[PDB]
From a paper:
Protein tyrosine phosphatases (PTPs) play a critical role in regulating cellular functions by selectively dephosphorylating their substrates. Here we report the crystal structures of 22 PTP domains, including two tandem-domain RPTP structures and a detailed structural comparison of this protein family.
This pocket has the potential to accommodate pY at the +1 position as in PTP1B or potentially other acidic or phosphorylated residues in positions N-terminal to the substrate pY. The new structural data and analysis presented here suggest that a secondary substrate-binding pocket, similar to that found in PTP1B, is present also in SHP2, BDP1, LYP, SHP1, TCPTP, MEG2, PTPBAS, DEP1, and GLEPP1. PTPs with particularly high enzymatic activity against generic substrates were RPTPσ and PTP subgroups R5, R3, NT1, NT2, NT3, NT4, and NT5. CD45 and members of subgroups R3 and R5 were extremely promiscuous and dephosphorylated most phosphopeptides with reasonable activity. All members of the R3 subgroup as well as RPTPγ were highly active, and it will be interesting to establish how this activity is regulated in vivo. Surprisingly, sedimentation velocity measurements showed that all single-domain RPTPs studied (IA2, IA2β, GLEPP1, DEP1, and STEP) were entirely monomeric in solution, as were tandem-domain receptor PTPs (RPTPα, CD45, RPTPɛ, and RPTPμ).
Author numbering:
A (entry chain A), B (entry chain A), C (entry chain A): -19 to 0, 1019 to 1139, 1151 to 1155, 1158 to 1174, 1177 to 1188, 1191 to 1201, 1211 to 1225, 1234 to 1300
């Protein structure tokens, strides 16, 4: 615990000053109207203000020569500070998975946001799932046994209900097993509903780059907790916080604006 | 959790090195004598050593053009890092109140230190009281209904005992209510007694600028807890910590020296 | 809670990136073989990589003119950030003891690592023991009453079993008493056994400079907890963390390599 003087770390200064924008829930009606005017231009400004948040943070792991083929996109790289570090065997660079711990409402490790695994990273994906005791997966878009072995880990599917759909697997170290529930997702009703569905039961959330839909989902889960326990809304401040842990969370003005659309609904 | 190398933030370095001065309570007699000698000159040095603590911290919110009329004094401005951020409606700058969270003995949000509200900030004052769930106010010197509405908040007075005096109000959102107890204060006996009085029952503490009497009060409350649970005294280190969260806490050598006078008494 | 941008504090950057090297316990057999090859050369590289960790941290207290005679060696000085600060009487510099809080598995104050006391620091040593509520001492190599007074503290010996050996003392403020147990230590069996012995019963650990054997002991205690609760090993990351709080913890390649020898055993 230390405070910083002005001038040391500009990023830290942004954080103290304008990292957050609280609205009481009983004023969100009036406020949402204000921002959906001149065609969303108010939300476009909040969204533009967030654009540089957290992008100055180091990402050495992700940029090493050996870890190039483990990243789906070159512009979506995990920040060193929040990345998920796997165990090691042959060299340090085994530890790498394009994945970050994201804060939820209750703690900082509530989520792992990650990209949809590559052919050459499926082994690492399941390793991550086992090592970090992952019990739920949220697929927001075929890396699973329709049992298959992936490295030192064996994955068996044990239930499939197609309605979104729900799947149950067992993950086992081939040298001990935990069970897993994956929630596969396929108006704002559907998103809000899909989440309340999910919440009955570290939550790994992936879309394709692990950033747009992934961010919208995590965000809405947090907003809902804040709407039920506090009686307030902070879309700006949640995305800010997500950006401080992984780049591009909520990737388009439309997703940002859409989050706000979901909130406006819950509030009625 | 990170440690800093030397040279990064001199303020942080001061904090690691000489931010604190512990005296066992059974040695405070001997020590107090030492500092009240050559006419208080020992306490004058501790007091001079504290003079620059925390003043290099950013205060952007407080210095914006729109927030000028919300500050009673121009030399008492809240640091960004600890300021109380209110909810928003028309623009960001609604969030502003000249107020800081101050640490108490038990946590960092134990107190809010603030200035005595201005005519144009009474609405914000009551909003702060409601939003941040304030149950006690400590007035250390007429912003209350002798019910009145202040913005979206309604304040009714429900009890007044004049002895110091004690008042009870109800604060209500005009769109849910909590009750409030205000302790209005009017030798070191009176201060020590006024506090023990207060403690039976986030505590908002205000004098005029929210800094001298405000700091002396908070400080003495902490010292007393430290004297009862630890068996030690750290006046220097408490003021240091208060300065790291709001400027000028304990504003004159006389208040500092007076805190020490109160301690010397409790110790007998 | 703040993250830092790249470039602010290189030490902090090292911490985010390569501060840690996790091995699942069921892979340590294969990994240990790899590092004991070309005559320990793999462990020599891990050990060389750790050599600069934490050495850029400020140590003002330890370097002041008045505190020179309180340090056994001039190259083993406590970092300001973790040093143990004693109470004061005649001036600030009374607070000084060549000692640092070291993190254990459960918290950051689990250990105090310190040098074997000097003739002119025995008073401070016992003061530290009393003030910081020390219940166990681990001697890893005659500062105790075979009752003697040391400053304002009286130390009586109450039990001595010679087998390593175990001693019990009572420490008393001569102006209240707690009891104390000292564990005096005299293959990897003996170290692992000596620890399990110790653990039945802030733990002060000292060798001569408070750094080699001291570090090996603390480290092995942490590794064992990590092997029992996680099912993993991180020798590199534990020493790293110890170096961030006191210099030279695990002082030779042989101690580092020996820690790994102890782990390899437990794993069988
Ligand atoms: Cl973090
Ligand atoms: Cl703070
Ligand atoms: Cl620390
Ligand atoms: Ni800390
Ligand atoms: Ni912390
Ligand atoms: Ni603070
Ligand atoms: Ni942290
Ligand atoms: Ni630390
Ligand atoms: Ni920092
Ligand atoms: Ni904090
Ligand atoms: Ni964080």
């Amino acid at each position: 615990h230390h405070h910083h003087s002005s001038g040391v770390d500009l990023g830290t200064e942004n954080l103290y000053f304008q990292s957050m924008k609280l609205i009481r829930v009983e004023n969100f009606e009036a406020y949402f109207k204000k921002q959906q005017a001149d065609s969303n231009c108010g939300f476009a400004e909040e969204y533009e203000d967030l654009k540089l948040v957290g992008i100055s943070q180091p990402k050495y792991a992700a940029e090493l020569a050996e870890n190039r083929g483990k990243n789906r996109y070159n512009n979506v790289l995990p920040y060193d500070i929040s990345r998920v570090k796997l165990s090691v065997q042959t060299h340090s660079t085994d530890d790498y998975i394009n994945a970050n711990y994201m804060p939820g409402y209750h703690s900082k490790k509530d989520f792992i946001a990650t990209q949809g695994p590559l052919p050459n990273t499926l082994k690492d994906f399941w390793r991550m799932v086992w090592e970090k005791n992952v019990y739920a997966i949220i697929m927001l878009t075929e890396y699973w046994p329709s049992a298959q072995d992936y490295g030192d880990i064996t994955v068996a599917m044990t239930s499939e209900i197609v309605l979104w759909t729900i799947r149950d697997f067992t993950v086992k170290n081939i040298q001990e097993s935990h069970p897993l529930r994956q929630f596969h997702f396929t108006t704002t009703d559907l998103l809000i509903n899909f989440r309340y569905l999910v919440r009955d039961y570290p939550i790994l959330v992936h879309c394709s780059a692990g950033v747009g839909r992934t961010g919208t989902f995590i965000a809405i889960d947090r907003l809902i907790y804040q709407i039920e326990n506090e009686n307030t809304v902070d879309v700006y401040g949640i995305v800010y916080d997500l950006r401080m842990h992984r780049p591009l969370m909520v990737q388009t003005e439309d997703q940002y604006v859409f989050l706000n659309q979901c909130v406006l609904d819950i509030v009625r």
